[PDB]
């Protein structure tokens, strides 16, 4: 049972899932409205969104007295973010500007990837070594979509029996997608293309917000119970509350290197020969060069117009 990292509006916390009766430890305090959270374990980084400060920030968790540092600003409603620990990129959703955007880990070279047919985008999860990204949208057309991490090949993978898809995660060992619906009160799973859908927790979840996974156990936050719940990822059995009395639980991850396992970066050692962004891609050679918003890629497929 891993440590669980969760946002909590005023702070980010870590709790040991084998001992959630104990009080969590505060990783970063003095926050206004921390909502999304993720990490790059190998770099010693934790990132979060703040929906009042309209920003994504980061902290260096292996240093003593390291500051909070703003890396992306002007984000009207950054309701979801994911760290690409392989390609070294930062992806996020914005439910007010209706966008999915990427940048480098320091916030540089921002590129809007999607800006059409989004209403209430929320969760976002990455499979960097396959070059795919997955997100939810709880708006007027509720759905789960996937696309290349380079913005290619966008596809709706779930569009039925869905209404408030809030939580989304991947099982990297089994190659499965899991999601939690706060209106339909359930957690389901499917293959990565949306096929072979199955119920895991069939009902009775009051208001799940974010979902993560470690080994054979799912973990999620619930806005109505103010707690983290867990159950078996195959059967939904063994449903237990492991940590409760949380001020305002938000996004959550199993905080482990094993959830970001080592793989070769297809960009190699020279940024893919790309002048600006080298993004993961689902097709060979498994990266795609890219440029900041509004900037054209030249005919070589590598160099942004200078």
């Amino acid at each position: 049972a891993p440590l669980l990292l969760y946002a909590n509006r005023r702070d980010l916390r870590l709790v040991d899932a084998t001992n959630g009766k104990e009080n969590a430890t505060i990783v970063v305090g003095g926050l206004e409205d921390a909502a999304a959270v993720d990490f790059v374990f190998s770099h010693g980084l934790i990132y979060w969104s703040d929906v009042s400060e309209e920003a994504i920030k980061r902290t260096e968790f292996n240093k003593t007295e390291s500051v909070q540092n703003v890396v992306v600003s002007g984000l009207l409603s950054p309701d979801g973010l994911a760290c690409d620990w392989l390609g070294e990129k930062l992806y996020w959703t914005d439910s007010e500007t209706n966008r999915i955007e990427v940048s480098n880990l320091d916030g540089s070279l921002r590129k809007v990837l999607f800006w059409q047919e989004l209403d209430q985008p929320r969760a976002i999860a990455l499979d960097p070594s396959s070059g795919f990204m997955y997100w939810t949208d709880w708006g007027e057309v509720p759905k789960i979509e996937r696309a290349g991490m380079d913005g290619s090949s966008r596809f709706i993978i779930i569009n039925s029996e869905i209404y408030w898809p809030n939580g989304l995660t991947l099982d990297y060992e089994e190659q499965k997608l899991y999601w939690a619906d706060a209106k339909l009160n359930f957690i389901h799973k499917s293959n990565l293309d949306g096929t072979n859908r199955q119920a895991v927790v069939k009902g009775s979840l009051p208001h799940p917000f974010a979902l993560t996974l470690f080994e054979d156990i799912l973990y999620w936050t619930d806005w109505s119970t103010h707690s983290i719940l867990a159950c078996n990822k195959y059967t939904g059995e063994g449903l237990r509350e492991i940590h409760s009395d949380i001020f305002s639980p938000m996004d959550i991850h199993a905080f482990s290197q094993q959830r970001q396992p080592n793989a070769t970066n297809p960009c190699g050692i020279d940024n893919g020969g790309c002048s600006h962004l080298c993004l993961m891609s689902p097709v060979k050679p498994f990266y795609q060069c890219a440029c900041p918003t509004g900037v054209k890629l030249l005919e070589n497929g590598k160099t942004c117009k200078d």
Binding site: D33, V51, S52, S77, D79, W138, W164, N166, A182, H207
Partner: peptide, 7 residues
């Protein structure tokens, strides 16, 4: 506002 991320 139901399901929206508050404040």
């Amino acid at each position: 506002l139901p399901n929206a991320i508050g404040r």
